[PDB]
Design a protein around this ligand. Structure first.
Ligand code: D73
Lengths: 133, 666
């Protein structure tokens, strides 16, 4: 019903290796060259990646900023309201970004701000100008 | 098996079923009620048991009926019919036994048997037992034919048949009780030794053998499951198929490597795209940090836009730093996945040069068993006689196999040195024209009712013929002769003064240097009481080594043995003999094999008797005159002694039926 274990023999393969006098040597050479081809292709991309790794040396260490640890506040200082309006102008609806810019306002408080100070800070107009870019 | 059922097995018969032959002689019983069949079968099996329990004395009908019980001994004609059938076809009272009823005073019919090999001798004894006039014509100065035994002093070594291939259902088991045969079991273990002269480690000595067995199963799969049996009109050989299987196993090895390195490039190219994204991000982070720095240099107090810039760029920087860290995360995963794949590559090669040479020994061993290059064997049929193999350990005849034919030859009219030149067969009878081998001009004529031809297939193949048939053998017979394979294997007898090998090791291999010479002195036997080593020449090497003198052959033998046991532990041989079976004019080879383009059906064709045309036109259909026995005529047991023996028994039964009449069929 099926070939022995560790033995590989398909109807397709038999016909291909018995097609002529040296169809056996031909098929085995096409794979011998295919192997050499792929082997030197490996060292090539290995070389390319080795150079790209060296250009990443040091990582992003001299570019990391220390962690700002501030507690979330409920009241809006005029300052924070003004930061918010500018954050909307730059980020639109990315409430997470806006929250991070202000620093001491939670993502929900940011969404609340959108409805509370909606008319007073023409947030409709501010948002439509963000989309204009 | 044991009892009455074991006797059926020991006679190669199904204990609980009637054979085709039995159906022919007893058509009343087999077509009858099931109860009668079982009575028949028991009678048959019990009679066989009686003969088998004591094969040194004739088993008569009277003695048989005596030991039968009710309700089996009630029908005395049924018992007489069964006994007669078994005696006629040589299932009981065959070989060498003491006769209770001394042979009939006058004989009936005359048979000339060509050749006093085992097949010839077996028939001769039977026909004489049936009361026929029998004369055997042997070309050699000895009986046995391809059962040749070298004897000198105490050295005894078979140049021909050597092995009893298991006693389970072997007619030679019966013969071995009748003849003083010193049967010694063969220890299976065979240590190989490479060209260098050093053993193959059990590690490889199993990897190769298991691969060899796997390669055979694979050819069997190629034949039966993929129907790969004809290629370019030519029938596919075992060799061709083995080559194809090996090539596909080398192909798979490469296919595996290709798709493994193909896994590496796909992952390495994923890394390439990730490192590019990382370099471009570290670039933007570099610039963005500078911008944040410059925004922080603007010291307070600052307006809200300037304060926003600082905060905004701070957010943007940690956001891009979030990405780079998640990209360095992925880099670590891909970077170790590459050390994963590079750590475990697939197989480098299918078989190395060292491997392929040890495999070639296994191929040579198979070429030895079939006495022919694997490229000559039929893929579909080379092993058609596997199902009929005997049970039990293979044995050797320690006192020389010739003891068997010589024992059979006793009390028989044998003309030695008598080379048959022509066989003439007509509606009225036969004349055989032979000459004296010593002075070829001295001619003999033999007139007979029937001729039993036991000429080897090698002989029958000769072109131009060594034996002429008048009239010529029919096209269906000669085509079978041409189609069938007649192979070759040779032996080198090496007689020493001392044992320098492992005495508990029966056989040990020598691995050749090339595929071309794998057969050349590949195996050595240590079987005899005396210090004798026997060297085999198989495969393509057998035919070539025959053109080389004994000294050179013995030279190469010593060389090989030196490499294995030490250059000073191997002395000069006192006596040496080299067989040349293909050269031998009375053999022209060693034994038959199922050639590519042949089948087991050709063996049946070989066994078919020839019936001459009528003398006077319009005269009734003549009796068959020319019968064939021998190794190459028995489909289920070809190329063996027991096969030859059995074919003899077969023909003797057929001839006696023809010329003495079958009284038991009523
Ligand atoms: C399966 C096997 N392969 C069995 C063997 C085996 C091998 C490996 C592992 C285990 C066992 C195995 N080994 C083994 C080795 C070698 C080296 C050879 C050679 C053969 C065998 N065989 C096969 C058997 O040896 C083989 O099958 C039988 O012995 C053959 O018996 P006939 O059928 O009767 O043929 P023949 O004896 O020729 O009688 C014909 C006579 O006619 C004469 N004549 C000629 N011309 C004439 C003329 N013009 N006018 C007048 N006369 C003329 C001519 O001179 C001759 O006397 C073995 N048979 C076994 O049972 N066991 C063995 O071990």
């Amino acid at each position: 019903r099926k070939p022995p274990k560790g033995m590989f023999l398909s109807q397709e393969d038999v016909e291909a290796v018995s097609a002529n006098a040296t169809a056996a040597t031909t098929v085995l050479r096409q794979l011998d060259m295919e192997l050499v081809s792929v082997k030197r292709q490996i060292q090539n991309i290995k070389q390319t990646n080795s150079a790209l790794k060296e250009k990443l040396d040091g990582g992003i260490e001299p570019y990391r900023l220390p962690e700002v640890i501030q507690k979330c506040n409920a009241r809006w200082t005029t300052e924070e309201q003004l930061l918010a309006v500018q954050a909307i102008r730059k980020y639109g609806r990315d409430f997470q970004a806006i929250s991070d810019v202000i620093g001491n306002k939670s993502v929900v408080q940011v969404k609340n701000f959108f409805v509370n100070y909606r008319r007073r800070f023409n947030i409709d107009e501010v948002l439509q100008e963000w989309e204009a870019e | 098996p044991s009892g009455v059922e074991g006797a059926a097995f020991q006679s190669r018969l199904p204990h609980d079923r009637m054979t085709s032959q039995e159906a022919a002689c007893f058509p009343d019983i087999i077509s009858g009620p099931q109860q009668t069949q079982k009575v028949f079968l028991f009678i048959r099996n019990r009679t066989l048991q009686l003969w088998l329990d004591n094969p040194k004395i004739q088993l008569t009908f009277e003695a048989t009926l005596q030991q039968l019980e009710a309700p089996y001994n009630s029908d005395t004609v049924l018992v007489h019919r069964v006994h007669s059938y078994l005696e006629r076809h040589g299932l009981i009272n065959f070989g060498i036994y003491k006769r209770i009823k001394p042979l009939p005073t006058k004989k009936t019919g005359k048979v000339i048997i060509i050749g006093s090999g085992v097949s010839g001798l077996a028939a001769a004894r039977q026909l004489q037992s049936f009361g026929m006039d029998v004369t055997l014509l042997e070309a050699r100065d000895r009986v046995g034919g391809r059962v040749a035994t070298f004897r000198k002093g105490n050295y005894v070594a078979d140049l021909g048949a050597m092995v009893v291939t298991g006693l389970g259902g072997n007619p030679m088991a019966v013969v071995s009780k009748q003849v003083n045969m010193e049967l010694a079991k063969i220890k299976q273990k065979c240590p190989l030794y490479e060209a260098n002269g050093q053993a193959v480690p059990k590690e490889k000595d199993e990897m190769v053998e298991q691969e060899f067995n796997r390669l055979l199963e694979a050819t069997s799969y190629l034949s039966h499951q993929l129907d790969f049996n004809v290629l370019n009109n030519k029938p596919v050989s075992l060799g061709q198929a083995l080559e194809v299987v090996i090539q596909l196993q080398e192909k798979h090895v490469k296919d595996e490597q290709i798709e493994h390195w193909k896994k590496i490039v796909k992952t390495q190219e994923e890394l390439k795209e990730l490192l590019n994204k990382m370099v471009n991000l570290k670039e933007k982070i570099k610039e963005l940090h500078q911008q944040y720095k410059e925004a922080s240099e603007v010291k307070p107090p600052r307006d809200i836009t300037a304060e926003f810039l600082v905060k905004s760029k701070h957010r943007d920087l940690t956001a891009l730093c979030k990405e780079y860290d998640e990209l360095a995360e992925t880099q670590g995963k891909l970077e170790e996945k590459l050390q994963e794949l590079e750590a475990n590559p697939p197989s480098d090669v299918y078989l190395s040069s060292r491997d392929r040479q040890i495999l070639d020994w296994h191929f040579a061993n198979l070429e030895f068993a079939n006495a022919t290059p694997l490229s000559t064997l039929s893929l579909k049929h080379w092993d058609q006689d596997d199902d009929f193999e005997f049970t039990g350990s293979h044995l050797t005849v320690r006192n020389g196999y010739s003891c068997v034919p010589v024992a059979l030859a006793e009390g028989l009219d044998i003309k030695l040195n008598t080379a048959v030149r022509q066989v003439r067969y007509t509606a009225s009878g036969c004349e055989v024209i032979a000459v004296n081998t010593r002075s070829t001009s001295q001619t003999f004529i033999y007139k007979c009712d029937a001729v039993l031809c036991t000429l080897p297939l090698g002989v029958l193949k000769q072109q131009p013929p060594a034996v002429q048939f008048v009239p010529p053998l029919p096209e269906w017979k000669t085509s079978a002769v041409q189609r069938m394979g007649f192979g070759n294997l040779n032996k080198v007898v090496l007689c020493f003064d001392r044992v320098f090998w492992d005495p508990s090791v029966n056989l040990f291999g020598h691995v050749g240097s090339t595929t071309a010479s794998r057969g050349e002195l590949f195996l050595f036997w240590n079987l005899y009481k005396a210090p004798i080593l026997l060297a085999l020449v198989a495969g393509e090497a057998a035919g070539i080594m025959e053109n080389i003198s004994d000294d050179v052959i013995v030279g190469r033998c010593l060389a090989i043995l030196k490499g294995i046991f030490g250059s000073s532990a191997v002395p000069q041989p006192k006596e040496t003999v080299v067989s040349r079976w293909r050269a031998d004019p009375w053999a022209r080879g060693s034994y038959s094999y199922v050639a590519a383009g042949s089948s087991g059906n050709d063996y049946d064709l070989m066994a078919q008797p020839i019936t001459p045309g009528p003398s006077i036109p319009g005269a009734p259909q003549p009796i068959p005159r020319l019968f064939f026995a021998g190794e190459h005529t028995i489909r289920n047991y070809p190329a063996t002694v027991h096969g030859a023996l059995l074919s003899g028994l077969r023909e003797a039964g057929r001839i006696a039926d023809q010329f003495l009449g079958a009284m038991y069929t009523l």
